[PDB]
């Protein structure tokens with residue numbers, strides 16, 4: 001009954017090992033309880049059935065200043081009733097069979113680990129036995145002993161999962177099995193670009209993120225601002241974000257808070273308006289449905305009035321820091337650090353400044369009830385040569401009554417539940433377990449939430465029209481010089497998420513909010529934008545484009561290690577190809593007949609170590625090849 005935690009002390013070398021457990025119950029005040037050294041060398045602790053969901057911290061029991069050591073430093077390792085886990089010498093937190101007396105095979109790499117190498121050398125081990133067997137992707141069972149290796153992913157096409165089952169029998173005669181899953185990832189090169197003249201100092205975020213993906217700069221089209229999405233399509237996305245990267249996810253337990261999760265920004269223009277579609281996600285339904293408010297439409301962004309901004313760069317030469325200027329009735333000049341801040345019932349610090357060049361802020365609000373919504377122009381130079389947003393010349397775009405939704409000067413905004421994208425990509429790691437930078441690691445636990453129960457109605461959309469005559473531009477300007485744009489989401493003051501995504505949205509995500517340390521300091525800190533804006537209409541003139549080359553993702557549908565006579569499907573995928581792609585599959589250099597398809601079925605006759613390959617050629621003669629190992 002209960003749960004068990006084991007600790008490998010062979011590297012830490014602590015005289016006494018303590019374990020501190022918190023969550024459903026606290027085992028004891030820090031430093032916790034003494035673990036028991038076993039003759040295996042491992043240290044062991046047990047927790048009763050009452051300790052249903054715990055976070056575990058190991059430590060040497062010593063005080064600050066007298067040699068205190070602990071691991072992890074903040075967020076404990078997850079352990080639930082019914083589990084038996086071990087912290088290895090390499091500091092992997094792994095399943096170690098189950099909390100009973102049976103034998104089990106286990107891996108020294110944590111279950112559900114993703115990897116981008118061609119294989120992952122996963123070491124195998126046995127608990128309460130000394131021989132086991134393994135089956136990988138349905139292979140015949142093959143014996144193994146402690147220390148042996150399995151090349152997980154060997155031979156396989158990228159973006160496939162690998163199943164690995166370990167079999168053992170203990171002294172009690174009970175045959176057990178432990179099934180593991182690993183993901184071999186593949187990431188195609190993406191065409192990306194930037195220009196020095198915009199003052200940006202951080203490269204556009206990539207991976208799942210993208211600024212002007214596939215060189216999409218928006219489209220010339222008339223949009224109907226009405227909350228219906230049939231007038232948009234995926235080709236019009238100028239900034240691709242990800243789901244579940246809003247700051248709350250980096251706190252130990254902040255999934256109860258309303259998300260501010262930007263997903264994608266689309267743009268179009270005609271001769272009258274500049275148009276935008278903003279998609280926001282709410283994955284709480286899937287990640288933490290126990291948090292009733294956040295996993296419900298009580299989380300809709302128009303529940304309360306929260307500032308939202310479209311930062312635009314019309315004149316590319318101007319740099320506006322965010323500072324604002326105005327005049328008093330007596331002619332005296334004043335400045336504020338941001339156009340809106342500690343303003344009318346927001347009594348919190350925070351804002352978003354700009355290094356990347358902008359000169360215009362469309363300052364609006366999430367339920368379109370702020371009669372002060374305005375287009376601010378950075379039309380006044382400060383002493384340092386930067387420009388300040390001018391209260392005196394702002395263009396009012398606010399409603400006269402919330403009920404009426406009658407925005408001034410032709411500004412149009414509609415919001416609704418809905419989702420335009422048919423994929424919602426983000427990280428689905430357990431709550432509390434997120435780490436800094438993990439949104440840029442392709443081996444984090446990325447999912448398409450539509451494969452995990454997401455529904456269109458979970459998300460939120462805003463459709464917006466900004467009249468060109470409020471921006472000092474026309475369609476010719478957009479199509480010939482272009483402009484830049486970024487959407488900013490707040491939770492009142494400071495930024496929380498942006499499109500394009502900027503790392504200042506997360507640089508302090510794991511720090512405590514002044515008024516409530518359960519939630520994120522990102523709600524109140526000072527952010528500063530350093531990535532490129534998304535271009536609309538045309539690239540900046542000094543843009544350097546980094547073109548992704550033609551490339552192939554190739555391999556088997558089954559892990560290396562299959563039995564003779566098993567049909568193995570060799571698959572090939574192409575990226576950045578021109579025209580038709582022809583694929584030539586080979587095994588030890590000998591061709592396999594594939595028709596003119598992207599797949600071939602190879603049935604190995606005899607044992608051996610085969611070199612499987614593909615050569616791909618497109619209609620402009622670009623060539624890509626891949627060669628992999630497959631063992632029978």
Ligand SMILES: OC[C@H]1O[C@@H]2O[C@H]3[C@H](O)[C@@H](O)[C@@H](O[C@H]4[C@H](O)[C@@H](O)[C@@H](O[C@H]5[C@H](O)[C@@H](O)[C@@H](O[C@H]6[C@H](O)[C@@H](O)[C@@H](O[C@H]7[C@H](O)[C@@H](O)[C@@H](O[C@H]1[C@H](O)[C@H]2O)O[C@@H]7CO)O[C@@H]6CO)O[C@@H]5CO)O[C@@H]4CO)O[C@@H]3CO
Nearest residue numbers: 020022029030057064070072073074075076252512517518
């Ligand atoms: O207690 C478990 C803790 O023990 C060890 O931490 C030392 C620590 O090094 C000392 O500084 C001191 O802690 C002081 C704090 O310095 C002081 O600020 C205050 O702490 C309060 C917090 O300020 C307040 O936010 C709240 O804390 C929450 C917290 O926000 C949650 O995230 C959660 O904290 C967990 C930690 O994340 C986790 O690492 C672990 O902490 C260990 C720590 O690793 C170790 O070095 O467990 C906690 C869960 O208990 O929950 C807490 C509480 O809800 O409340 C605390 C009030 O305690 O006071 C503490 C005195 O404890 O002393 C501890 C040794 O106890």
Ligand SMILES: [Ca+2]
Nearest residue numbers: 224226228231
């Ligand atoms: Ca529409």
Ligand SMILES: [Ca+2]
Nearest residue numbers: 241242261262
């Ligand atoms: Ca997001």
Ligand SMILES: [Ca+2]
Nearest residue numbers: 504507508527
């Ligand atoms: Ca920040």
Ligand SMILES: [Ca+2]
Nearest residue numbers: 494495522527
């Ligand atoms: Ca912030």
